[PDB]
Amino acid sequence: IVGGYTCGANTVPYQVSLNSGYHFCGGSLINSQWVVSAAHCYKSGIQVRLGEDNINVVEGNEQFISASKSIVHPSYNSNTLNNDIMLIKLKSAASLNSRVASISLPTSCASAGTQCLISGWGNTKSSGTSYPDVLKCLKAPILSDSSCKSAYPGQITSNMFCAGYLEGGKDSCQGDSGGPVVCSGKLQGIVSWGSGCAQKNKPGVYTKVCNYVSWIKQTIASN
Numbered sequence: 001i002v003g004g005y006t007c008g009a010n011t012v013p014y015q016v017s018l019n020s021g022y023h024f025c026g027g028s029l030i031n032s033q034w035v036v037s038a039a040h041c042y043k044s045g046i047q048v049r050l051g052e053d054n055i056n057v058v059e060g061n062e063q064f065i066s067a068s069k070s071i072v073h074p075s076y077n078s079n080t081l082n083n084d085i086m087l088i089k090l091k092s093a094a095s096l097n098s099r100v101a102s103i104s105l106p107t108s109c110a111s112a113g114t115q116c117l118i119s120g121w122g123n124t125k126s127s128g129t130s131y132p133d134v135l136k137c138l139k140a141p142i143l144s145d146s147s148c149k150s151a152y153p154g155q156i157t158s159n160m161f162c163a164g165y166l167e168g169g170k171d172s173c174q175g176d177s178g179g180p181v182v183c184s185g186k187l188q189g190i191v192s193w194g195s196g197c198a199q200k201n202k203p204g205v206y207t208k209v210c211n212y213v214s215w216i217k218q219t220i221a222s223n
């Protein structure tokens with residue numbers, strides 16, 4: 001997260017870190033057994049880390065639970081990033097309390113102008129590299145479909161939305177991928193892609209979670 005703020009420990013209780021020996025992507029806990037992330041974050045051997053603030057220090061609220069199964073969206077296209085969503089099942093159920101909690105799925109799609117909370121452990125610089133150890137947060141609005149398409153001609157599908165600031169300086173970034181965009185207490189987006197980070201006229205692009213609620217529910221119900 002570039003141009004954000006330190007969230008505070010366990011203030012984003014649905015945020016998870018996906019770990020394969022190291023943090024590599026975010027995700028969102030949607031029930032005791034299941035995490036939403038980006039399909040482009042897929043790999044084998046994932047350990048889901050819940051209750052994290054500093055990802056390099058054991059602070060006392062963590063739950064580390066290996067994944068049993070990952071399910072990339074049936075129509076994920078890694079070239080275009082269309083349908084950039086996957087589900088990860090935990091080998092055992094997480095213990096839920098105020099520091100580790102699921103986030104609700106949306107019942108309707110959010111609108112341009114709505115304020116959301118984007119979070120993650122990704123790079124905090126737009127030029128060069130600095131990774132935080134504690135969770136960063138950014139409040140940002142959803143942008144109009146027209147301004148999103150004008151920013152990224154030929155690239156924005158109906159399964160994507162832009163959020164952030166066209167002036168630059170505030171955005172998600174590498175290492176945030178797969179993490180949440182939460183608006184009015186609902187998971188509306190997944191950190192997906194963008195041109196660089198925090199660049200002028202290059203806002204963040206997010207997977208539009210409301211399009212996937214029926215797939216998510218039916219997949220969980222049978223897996």
Ligand SMILES: [Ca+2]
Nearest residue numbers: 054057058059
């Ligand atoms: Ca920790």
